[PDB]
Amino acid sequence: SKEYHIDEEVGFALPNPQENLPDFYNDWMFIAKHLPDLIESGQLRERVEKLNMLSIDHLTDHKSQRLARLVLGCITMAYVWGKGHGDVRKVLPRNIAVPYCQLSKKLELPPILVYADCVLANWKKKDPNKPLTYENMDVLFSFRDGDCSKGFFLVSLLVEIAAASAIKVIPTVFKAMQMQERDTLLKALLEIASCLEKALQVFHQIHDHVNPKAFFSVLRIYLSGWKGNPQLSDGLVYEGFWEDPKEFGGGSAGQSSVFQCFDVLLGIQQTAGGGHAAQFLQDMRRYMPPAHRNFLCSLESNPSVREFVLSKGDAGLREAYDACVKALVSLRSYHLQIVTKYILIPASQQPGGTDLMNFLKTVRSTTEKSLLKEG
Numbered sequence: 001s002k003e004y005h006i007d008e009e010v011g012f013a014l015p016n017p018q019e020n021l022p023d024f025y026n027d028w029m030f031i032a033k034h035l036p037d038l039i040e041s042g043q044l045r046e047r048v049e050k051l052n053m054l055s056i057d058h059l060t061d062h063k064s065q066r067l068a069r070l071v072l073g074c075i076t077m078a079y080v081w082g083k084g085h086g087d088v089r090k091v092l093p094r095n096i097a098v099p100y101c102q103l104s105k106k107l108e109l110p111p112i113l114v115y116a117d118c119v120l121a122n123w124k125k126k127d128p129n130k131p132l133t134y135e136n137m138d139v140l141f142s143f144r145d146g147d148c149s150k151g152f153f154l155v156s157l158l159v160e161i162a163a164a165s166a167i168k169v170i171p172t173v174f175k176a177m178q179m180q181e182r183d184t185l186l187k188a189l190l191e192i193a194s195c196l197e198k199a200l201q202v203f204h205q206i207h208d209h210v211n212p213k214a215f216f217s218v219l220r221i222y223l224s225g226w227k228g229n230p231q232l233s234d235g236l237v238y239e240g241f242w243e244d245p246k247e248f249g250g251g252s253a254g255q256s257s258v259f260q261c262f263d264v265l266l267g268i269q270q271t272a273g274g275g276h277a278a279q280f281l282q283d284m285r286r287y288m289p290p291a292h293r294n295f296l297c298s299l300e301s302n303p304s305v306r307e308f309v310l311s312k313g314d315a316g317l318r319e320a321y322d323a324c325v326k327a328l329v330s331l332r333s334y335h336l337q338i339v340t341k342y343i344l345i346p347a348s349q350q351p352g353g354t355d356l357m358n359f360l361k362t363v364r365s366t367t368e369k370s371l372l373k374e375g
């Protein structure tokens, strides 16, 4: 279980992320902490081009390597996208590309900013004795003033944390199936449903902290990657590390282990078949920390909860199972309504969307298809 790097309180999020690196990395830190100013005044690219190549050896534990990935990922997005108006750099200068690629190799993550960087490791409490609540929290790194990165990253994190309450019930579910403990199983499924239902109320905060225009025209640009992307159609050159340009997708909650883990738990076969949705979410597991992709693989290998419940002729168990599935459907329906507000409407107002909505609707429909009763 410890091999899976799951926290009792914060689940897949990194507990108490580190905020400072060794003084040896001050040159990186200085750029990452001043991105909005450096990007806006046109100083960011020259500063990156001027860095000396720093060795990754003095980053000696997981938390410091994770902070360094966050730093280097944010700087890389700023260097590639610049001021976010379509002037793009196609080559990442060796003095940053090399350590970023070596550090990424060591962490078994791709050399692009991922969800586990900009959400799961990108946070702090304001006051260490107050709860994990939005008002008591902040992000460590933003891209531009007004980009709403705080509201976007933290609300994602707060959903991620609410879902965590359900993760610790998972071994109860499997124990109860194998021990033939019907009441324990039912109580465990109801508890999972309850937490997933709570996570939905958390998502409502998106409307308070994120504004559609800033999201659509700024933050979305900085989180974009270079896979299937016409602005960088062969991907990015990581100078001095690979000879040929490489394609990696940009930051995506398709990379969240929370939602992928409940679909697997419940037998929702989100990654089955050869369709586009299934392959994208399968591919995103490559963008998750290895301990969390290990967790998902081990869930896949357990007896099927859905098969257990379907074979008992037990209405209580069916209804509890269905409450879990329904909770995921309600989350995904609410999320679709967010996407209409934050992407479809802004894109209509500026002087594509259907493929996005069709991906999301495929995943919601696959979830709905798992209901045992029409729920």
Ligand code: HEM
Residues within 6 Å of the ligand: 155, 156, 157, 159, 160, 203, 206, 210, 215, 251, 252, 253, 254, 256, 259, 332, 335, 338, 339, 342, 343, 356, 359, 360, 363, 364
């Ligand atoms: C402004 C708010 C948001 C917008 C515009 C938005 C947009 C999108 C888009 C475009 C995708 C498709 C995948 C991709 O392009 O990378 C997606 C997928 C997804 N988003 Fe969001 N999102 C928002 C907030 C959230 C939050 C707060 C969460 C909670 C962690 C979340 C969880 C998901 C999940 C899990 C997927 C994968 C599909 C699924 O499992 O249903 N999103 N989102």
Ligand SMILES: c1ccc(-c2cnc[nH]2)cc1
Residues within 6 Å of the ligand: 115, 118, 119, 152, 153, 156, 223, 251, 252, 253, 254
């Ligand atoms: C950081 C935080 C959230 C996201 C996201 C939300 N929905 C899809 N991706 C991507 C990066």
